[PDB]
Design an enzyme around this catalytic site. Structure first.
Site, PDB file in Angstrom:
ATOM      1  N   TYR A 175       2.775   4.918   0.714  1.00  0.00           N
ATOM      2  CA  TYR A 175       3.591   5.438   1.802  1.00  0.00           C
ATOM      3  C   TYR A 175       2.665   6.340   2.622  1.00  0.00           C
ATOM      4  O   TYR A 175       2.173   7.347   2.112  1.00  0.00           O
ATOM      5  CB  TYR A 175       4.767   6.245   1.224  1.00  0.00           C
ATOM      6  CG  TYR A 175       5.885   5.411   0.620  1.00  0.00           C
ATOM      7  CD1 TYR A 175       6.330   4.244   1.245  1.00  0.00           C
ATOM      8  CD2 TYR A 175       6.493   5.782  -0.580  1.00  0.00           C
ATOM      9  CE1 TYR A 175       7.360   3.464   0.691  1.00  0.00           C
ATOM     10  CE2 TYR A 175       7.529   5.008  -1.147  1.00  0.00           C
ATOM     11  CZ  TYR A 175       7.951   3.850  -0.503  1.00  0.00           C
ATOM     12  OH  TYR A 175       8.949   3.070  -1.041  1.00  0.00           O
TER      13      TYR A 175
ATOM     14  N   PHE B  54       6.639   1.588  -4.710  1.00  0.00           N
ATOM     15  CA  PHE B  54       8.005   1.920  -4.288  1.00  0.00           C
ATOM     16  C   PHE B  54       8.463   3.385  -4.499  1.00  0.00           C
ATOM     17  O   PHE B  54       9.035   3.997  -3.583  1.00  0.00           O
ATOM     18  CB  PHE B  54       8.980   0.941  -4.938  1.00  0.00           C
ATOM     19  CG  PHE B  54       8.712  -0.504  -4.575  1.00  0.00           C
ATOM     20  CD1 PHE B  54       9.060  -1.006  -3.315  1.00  0.00           C
ATOM     21  CD2 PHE B  54       8.092  -1.361  -5.485  1.00  0.00           C
ATOM     22  CE1 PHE B  54       8.793  -2.343  -2.963  1.00  0.00           C
ATOM     23  CE2 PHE B  54       7.819  -2.696  -5.146  1.00  0.00           C
ATOM     24  CZ  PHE B  54       8.172  -3.186  -3.881  1.00  0.00           C
TER      25      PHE B  54
ATOM     26  N   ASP C  93       0.813  -1.216   0.000  1.00  0.00           N
ATOM     27  CA  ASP C  93       0.000   0.000   0.000  1.00  0.00           C
ATOM     28  C   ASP C  93       0.853   1.275   0.000  1.00  0.00           C
ATOM     29  O   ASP C  93       2.068   1.224   0.223  1.00  0.00           O
ATOM     30  CB  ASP C  93      -1.022   0.006   1.153  1.00  0.00           C
ATOM     31  CG  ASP C  93      -0.391  -0.109   2.515  1.00  0.00           C
ATOM     32  OD1 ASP C  93       0.824  -0.383   2.598  1.00  0.00           O
ATOM     33  OD2 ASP C  93      -1.130   0.076   3.508  1.00  0.00           O
TER      34      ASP C  93
ATOM     35  N   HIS D 264      11.453 -10.111  -0.080  1.00  0.00           N
ATOM     36  CA  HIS D 264      11.266  -8.674  -0.179  1.00  0.00           C
ATOM     37  C   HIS D 264      12.594  -7.948   0.023  1.00  0.00           C
ATOM     38  O   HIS D 264      13.442  -8.406   0.795  1.00  0.00           O
ATOM     39  CB  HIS D 264      10.255  -8.214   0.863  1.00  0.00           C
ATOM     40  CG  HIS D 264       9.659  -6.873   0.575  1.00  0.00           C
ATOM     41  ND1 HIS D 264      10.100  -5.719   1.184  1.00  0.00           N
ATOM     42  CD2 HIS D 264       8.671  -6.498  -0.268  1.00  0.00           C
ATOM     43  CE1 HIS D 264       9.408  -4.691   0.730  1.00  0.00           C
ATOM     44  NE2 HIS D 264       8.533  -5.136  -0.154  1.00  0.00           N
TER      45      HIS D 264
END
Lengths: 223, 82
Positions: free
Chosen positions: A63, A74, A61, A184
Site C-alpha cells: 500500500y 492485503f 505490491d 480479484h
C-alpha cells in the site's frame, strides 16, 4: 523443521537479490519515502514458517499510502480504513462462514500465525507511486519462493485472485497442491466471480480432509 | 496524486486506498472495452454517498488516465472514458 533460511540461504546472496536491496536502500538514502519500513519488509516469512504454510494468498505490491502497509499482503495497520478489496473479502467470509462477522479492522496477523502466507509479489513501493518498484528484482525473488514451497511441500492451498496472480500459479504442480483461482476481490471485478467462490471454505475442507486443523478466518487484534 | 484528476472530474476530494494491476482481458470484460496495456485500478471510497470511485490509468511510470468508474452499493458502475 525446514526453515525459510534453509531453502533461501543461497539466494539471499546471489546477484540480483543484493542489487535489489542495495537499490531500495539507496533511494531511501537520497530521501525517497519507501513503504513499508524495512523492519517489516519480510514480515510474511517472520509470521509464517516454511513448515507452517497451509494456505497461500498472493498480493501485488505494498500500500503506497502512509501507515497502510506493514509487510503482509492485503493486511493494513490497525486504525487504518479497511481497503476496498479486503472489505469485499470480508463480505464473502461473512456470506460463507456461519457466525463470521465484520472485524472493524484490517490487521491480518492472526491469519499468518495460523499458516497463511500473505506474500506480495513485489515487496516495496515508492510512497505515492503504485507499482514503482516493479522490475527492481523482487518478482524474481518471490517467484523463487513460490517455486520452493511447490517443491518442498505437499498439500498446500493456493488462492490466486486475478489474472496476474494466476500467472505465477503456472509454476505450482496441481497434483501436489490445491490451487484455487477467482477474479480479484476488487470492486471492479468482485461481482464477476469473486463473490461466492467459497474459497475460504474449500480451503478449510481440504485441510480437515487432510487431517489438518482449519483456519479461524476471524481476524483477532493481538496482545 | 491521481486524486486531483478524480476531483477535477467529480468534485470529489477522495484519497486512493489501493491500486490493483489488471490485464487488458480482465478490464475488457467489465468495462467492455479493451485497453492496449495493463491498467491500474486506483480505488477510493466515497463514504458520503456510499460508492466506490476507481480511476483507470496505464501502468507505472506512465499513469495515464484511461477511464473513471463509479460503482454504487448495488454493484452497478457509471463508466466514463477519459
Amino acid at each position: 523443521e525446514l526453515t525459510w533460511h534453509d531453502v533461501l540461504a543461497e539466494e539471499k546472496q546471489q546477484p540480483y537479490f543484493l542489487n535489489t536491496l542495495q537499490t531500495v536502500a539507496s533511494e531511501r538514502q537520497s530521501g525517497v519515502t519507501i513503504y513499508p519500513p524495512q523492519k517489516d519488509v519480510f514480515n510474511a516469512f517472520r509470521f509464517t514458517e516454511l513448515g507452517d504454510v497451509k494456505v497461500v494468498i498472493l498480493g501485488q505490491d505494498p500500500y503506497h499510502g502512509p501507515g497502510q502497509a506493514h509487510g503482509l499482503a492485503f493486511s493494513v495497520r490497525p486504525g487504518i480504513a479497511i481497503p476496498p478489496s479486503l472489505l469485499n473479502m470480508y463480505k464473502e467470509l461473512e456470506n460463507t462462514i456461519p457466525g463470521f462477522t465484520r472485524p472493524n479492522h484490517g490487521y491480518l496477523e492472526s491469519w499468518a500465525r495460523q499458516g497463511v502466507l500473505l506474500l506480495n509479489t513485489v515487496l516495496t513501493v515508492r510512497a505515492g507511486q503504485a507499482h514503482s518498484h516493479a522490475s527492481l528484482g523482487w518478482e524474481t525473488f518471490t517467484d523463487k519462493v513460490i517455486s520452493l514451497i511447490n517443491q518442498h511441500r505437499e498439500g498446500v492451498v493456493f488462492l490466486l485472485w486475478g489474472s496476474h496472480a494466476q500467472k505465477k500459479g503456472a509454476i505450482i504442480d496441481k497434483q501436489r497442491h490445491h490451487v484455487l483461482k477467482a477474479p480479484h476481490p476488487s470492486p471492479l471485478s468482485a461481482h464477476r466471480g469473486f463473490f461466492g467462490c467459497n474459497h475460504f471454505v474449500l480451503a478449510n475442507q481440504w485441510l480437515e480432509q487432510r487431517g489438518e486443523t482449519p483456519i479461524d478466518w476471524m481476524p483477532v487484534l493481538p496482545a | 496524486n491521481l486524486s486531483d484528476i478524480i476531483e477535477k472530474e467529480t468534485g470529489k476530494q477522495l484519497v486512493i486506498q489501493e491500486s490493483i494491476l489488471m490485464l487488458p482481458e480482465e478490464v475488457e470484460e467489465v468495462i467492455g472495452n479493451k485497453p492496449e496495456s495493463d491498467i491500474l485500478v486506483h480505488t477510493a471510497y466515497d463514504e458520503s454517498t456510499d460508492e466506490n470511485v476507481m480511476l483507470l490509468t496505464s501502468d507505472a511510470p506512465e499513469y495515464k488516465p484511461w477511464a473513471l468508474v463509479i460503482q454504487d452499493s448495488n454493484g452497478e458502475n457509471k463508466i466514463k472514458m477519459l
